[PDB]
Amino acid sequence: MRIILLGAPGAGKGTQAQFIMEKYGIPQISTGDMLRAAVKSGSELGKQAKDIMDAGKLVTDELVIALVKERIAQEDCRNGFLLDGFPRTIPQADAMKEAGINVDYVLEFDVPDELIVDRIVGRRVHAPSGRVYHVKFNPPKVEGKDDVTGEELTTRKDDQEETVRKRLVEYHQMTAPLIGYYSKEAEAGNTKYAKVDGTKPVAEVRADLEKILG
Ligand SMILES: Nc1ncnc2c1ncn2[C@@H]1O[C@H](COP(=O)(O)OP(=O)(O)O)[C@@H](O)[C@H]1O
Ligand SMILES: Nc1ncnc2c1ncn2[C@@H]1O[C@H](COP(=O)(O)O)[C@@H](O)[C@H]1O
Numbered sequence: 001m002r003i004i005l006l007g008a009p010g011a012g013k014g015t016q017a018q019f020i021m022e023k024y025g026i027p028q029i030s031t032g033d034m035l036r037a038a039v040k041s042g043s044e045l046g047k048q049a050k051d052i053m054d055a056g057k058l059v060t061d062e063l064v065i066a067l068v069k070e071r072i073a074q075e076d077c078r079n080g081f082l083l084d085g086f087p088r089t090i091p092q093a094d095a096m097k098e099a100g101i102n103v104d105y106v107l108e109f110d111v112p113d114e115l116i117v118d119r120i121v122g123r124r125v126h127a128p129s130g131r132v133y134h135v136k137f138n139p140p141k142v143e144g145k146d147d148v149t150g151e152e153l154t155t156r157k158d159d160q161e162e163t164v165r166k167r168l169v170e171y172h173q174m175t176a177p178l179i180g181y182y183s184k185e186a187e188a189g190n191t192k193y194a195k196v197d198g199t200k201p202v203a204e205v206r207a208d209l210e211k212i213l214g
Contacts, residue, residue: 001213002080003083004087005017008168009116009120011116011198012205014084015202027076027081029068029072029077030084031068035067036127056158057166068083069099088174093182104191105194106185106186107196108194109196116168120159122136125153126153128151129149131147131148137202140153196209
């Protein structure tokens, strides 16, 4: 099974990607996670993203397409995968099509602009695994600690209000058009498309996704 998660920053994509990985046994391919990791390690493919992410801007289509292709070509993706935060532009989607990377489900997480900044204020992450928490809405079992490793959680460098604002503008300019794009793909019978209400509690969004996917 191959899945794309679509939606504004803070919609709940990374959170639900974890559940889907656990339930359906497919890997989460998060271009944000990969680029952050590339910057941290100084990997030649992706270290270039540091300043661009800090500005809340999208990195080049070229760079992330390469990252995704490398990840996909590996073993653990042979039998399905979930793309979380990719594609982010129509050229990225077209590159998938040209490379014959079709998908089974596109899942649109719908959350009002107004919930985004406030929501992301509370985001804390465990960078080694990609696990995401919220100090109020989805807390770790021990305050400030990852549930698995017990390591102190961090705040993403791009998760401050001003940067989130810039990211949302970029989302509407470049990324929102993927809703139309994939809706048209679904009308052509190339994928299934479903929209979920991302304002519901984490557990309810999870149950809504299970109904669609199961
Ligand atoms: N349905 C939800 N209701 C409230 N908070 C949520 C929900 N889903 C995720 N969150 C929290 O809001 C923040 C953004 O969620 P995340 O899954 O990281 O969004 P995205 O990956 O789409 O940017 C995270 O801190 C997360 O813990
Ligand atoms: N598919 C992508 N295309 C372009 N830039 C990306 C992509 N994925 C992540 N980024 C960059 O990484 C940041 C964080 O992405 P994310 O973790 O999905 O929120 C974005 O604001 C961009 O700067």
